[PDB]
Amino acid sequence: TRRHKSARQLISDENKRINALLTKANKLVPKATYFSVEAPPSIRP
Amino acid sequence: IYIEANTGAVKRVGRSDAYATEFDLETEEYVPLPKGEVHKKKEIVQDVTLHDLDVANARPQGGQDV
Amino acid sequence: KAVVIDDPPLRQTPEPFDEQSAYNPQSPIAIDFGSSKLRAGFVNHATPTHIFPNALTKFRDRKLNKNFTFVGNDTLLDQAVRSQSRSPFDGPFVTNWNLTEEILDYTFHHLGVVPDNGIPNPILLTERLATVQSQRTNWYQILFETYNVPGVTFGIDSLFSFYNYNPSGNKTGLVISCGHEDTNVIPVVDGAGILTDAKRINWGGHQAVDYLNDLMALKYPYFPTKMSYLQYETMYKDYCYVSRNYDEDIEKILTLENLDTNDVVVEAPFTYDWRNSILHLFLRGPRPHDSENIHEQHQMHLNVERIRVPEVIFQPTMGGQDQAGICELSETILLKKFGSQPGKLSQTSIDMVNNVLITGGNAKVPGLKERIVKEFTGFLPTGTNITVNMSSDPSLDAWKGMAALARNEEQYRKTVISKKEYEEYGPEYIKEHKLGNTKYFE
C-alpha cells in the first residue's frame, strides 16, 4: 500500500530529515540541497 | 559621475535610476545611465590670447577655485 | 478586426505504435519525465517518435460498465475526455505513483516491445535539480521491481542539453533552463556541472499562465464566459514577447501611437473624452467602447501584459517571489565566483561567457536572447566576446542529450547503476558523475 503524500509536506519532510542529519552530525557542511540552491534575494531595490 | 583624465575634473551628475526605488520620496535626483561607452577620447584645439595668459598669472587676491 | 481563439483541435486519428519486429533487447530506452510532456523512444533514432502531454482519464462507460483508460494523445479525441485529463505532476514533483506506472505501461505498449519477465532494456532518465530522496527511492522501487530493467542512469535535462550542444564533454559554459515550473542557472566547468553554485527561481510556464489567468480575472471581473486553461496557454504562446528595455517600454506603451499596432483583441467564443482617459486605453484600447454591442463585451485587450509577464523572470518581485533576477544571479555567478574578482574576469569566467546556452520549454518566447545579450553587455567589462546559443526548438535537446550520451559508450558506463549496485547499497545511494546530481553533503 502507498500513502498519497502530497507535495506540501514533502519540503517539510526533507527539512526535518536534513535537520535530523545535521543534529546527529552536531552530537558537516551541506553541499547541494533544495534549500541551498534556492536563490538569494535581490540586493538592488 | 564624470571624470576627466588630464585635469582630474570631478562632477557628480546624480544617482543612477536603478537606485530610485530605495525610498518613495527622496531629496536626490536620479539620472539614467550614460548610453555611450565609459571611455571617451576626443581631440580639441584650444585658442587663447596673450592677454589671457597675462591675466592668469596676475591675480592680486589669489587664484579662484572651480 | 478582433481575433477569436478556441481550444486546440482534437486529433482525428489515434497515435500509432511501432512495429514489434523492429524491437531489439540490446537497445536502451530514453525517457524524459518532463513536467509538461513525455518523450519516449529508442536511442538509434534521432527524430522523436512519441511526444504527448502526461495525462490520463478513467472513462466509465454506461453500456459496458467498464472503466476505459485513455493516455496522452488518446485524451485528445473528445472534449469531455480532454477536460477530465489528470496530470501526475503535483507541484514540481510527482505524488500519485500508479498513474506513472500506467503511463509507463502505455509507452511500453506503444513502443512495439514484446518483453518477457520485465523489460530487458536499461533506461535513460532525466530528473529535476536537487531531487528529494523519496521520489528517487520510489523510482528505484518501481523500476527495479515492477519492470525488471537491468540498468539505470540519471541526470539533469539542462546539463544533458548542454552536453548535447557540447559533445566533447569537457567544455566550460553557463547553461540557463526555463522549465515548465522552475528556472535554473547552472555554471558548468570542464564539462562537469558545478551544482554548489547552481541557482533556482520559482517561476516557470505554469506560473506565467496562472499569472495570465488571474490577471484576466482581475482586469475584467464582470466577464460572463469562463475560458479554459488552454486558451490562456495559447494566447500566452502567441501574443507575448520579452521587452528589450522594460523601463523605457513601460513609459510609452499606453500612448495612442503604440496601441494601434501593439494591442491584441481576443474574442471569446459564443453562440469626458475617451482619448484622454487611460482607463479606456487600458481596458478597451484605442477604439471606442459600446456597451450595447453583444460581441464587444466578449473581448480581451492585451496591451501591457504582453511585456509584463515575461519580465517576471527578470524581476521576480512582480510575481511575489522574493528572489534575485536572472541577470543579477548571472552577475553573482560570473563576477564574484569561480575565482573571478569583480572587475577582473578569470579565464573560467571568460570561457563561461563564450558558451552561454539557453534551453528549456520556456525559451520559445521571442526577444529573450536579445534581452539577455543586452544585459550581458550591460554588466560585463568592455570587449568581452559574449556568445549566446539558442536552439530552434529547445524543448527537444534533452532527448538529443541522452541520445548522444548513450551513443557515446565510453562515457555511458560511468553513470549507469545496475541491479547489483542497487541491491548491495539500497535505494540510498548517490552516483557522483559530471552530468547529474551530487551528494547532499560534503
**C247 contacts in chain B (CB < 8 Å):** 17
Q: DSSP code of C381? A: P
Coil, strand or helix: which one is C58? strand
| Closest chain C residue to the Cα of A25, Cα to Cα | C441
Q: Do residues C435 and C414 touch, judged by C-beta distance below 8 A?
A: no
Q: Specify which residues C155 forms β-bridges with.
A: C126
> Are residues B17 and C247, on separate chains, in Cβ contact within 8 Å?
yes
Q: What is the DSSP letter of C440?
A: S
Contacts of C121 (CB under 8 A, 6+ apart): C25, C26, C27, C28, C29, C113, C149, C150
For chain C, which chains pass the contact test of at least 3 CB pairs under 8 Å? Answer: A, B
Distance CA C357, CA C9 (A): 34
Strand order in the sheet with C51-53: C51-53, C37-41, C29-33, C123-126, C151-155, C417-418
Strand partners, B26: none
- What string of DSSP letters covers B1-65? -EE-TTT--EE---EEGGGSSSSSS-SS-EE---SS-S-----------HHHHHHHS--SS----
Q: What is the resolution of this structure in A?
A: 3.3
In angstroms, the Cα distances linking C244 to C356, C371, C374 are 19, 5, 8
Task: Give yes or no for a contact between C285 and C324, defined as CB atoms under 8 angstroms apart.
Answer: no
As a whole number of angstroms, the distance between CA C374 and CA C385 comes to 13
Contacts of C382 in chain B (CB under 8 A): 37-39
Handedness of CA C187, C189, C192, C197 (dihedral sign): negative
Q: Indicate yes or no: CB of A32 within 8 angstroms of CB of C196.
A: yes
Coil, strand, or helix at residue C57?
strand
Residue with cell 485587450: C301
Inspect the interface and report whether the beta carbons of C247 and B38 lie closer than 8 Å.
no
Output the CA torsion sign for C320, C326, C328, C330.
Answer: positive
How close is the nearest chain A Cα to the Cα of B17, in Å?
11
The amino acid sitting at A43 is: I
State which approach was used to obtain the coordinates.
cryo-EM
DSSP C304-332: SHHHHTTHHHH-TTTTT-----HHHHHHH
Query: Count of residues for chain B?
Result: 66
| Chain B: touching chains (3 or more CB pairs < 8 Å) | A, C
CB contact under 8 A, C382 and B17: no
| Pairwise CA distance, residues C348 & C326, whole Å | 20
Contact call for C133 and A17, based on CB within 8 A: yes
The conformation of residue C365, written as its DSSP 8-state character, comes to S
Say yes or no: C247 contacts chain B, CB-CB below 8 A.
yes
Query: Residue holding cell 498513474?
Result: C99
Whether the Cβ atoms of residue C232 and residue C209 lie closer than 8 Å to each other? yes
For helices C368-379 and C326-335, what crossing angle results, to 10°? 40
C329 in Cβ contact with C201 (< 8 Å): yes
Burial of C97 by CB count in 10 Å (0-12 exposed, 13-18 middle, 19+ buried)? middle
Provide the strand spans (E) within C105-241.
123-126, 151-155, 173-178, 183-189, 192-193, 199-201
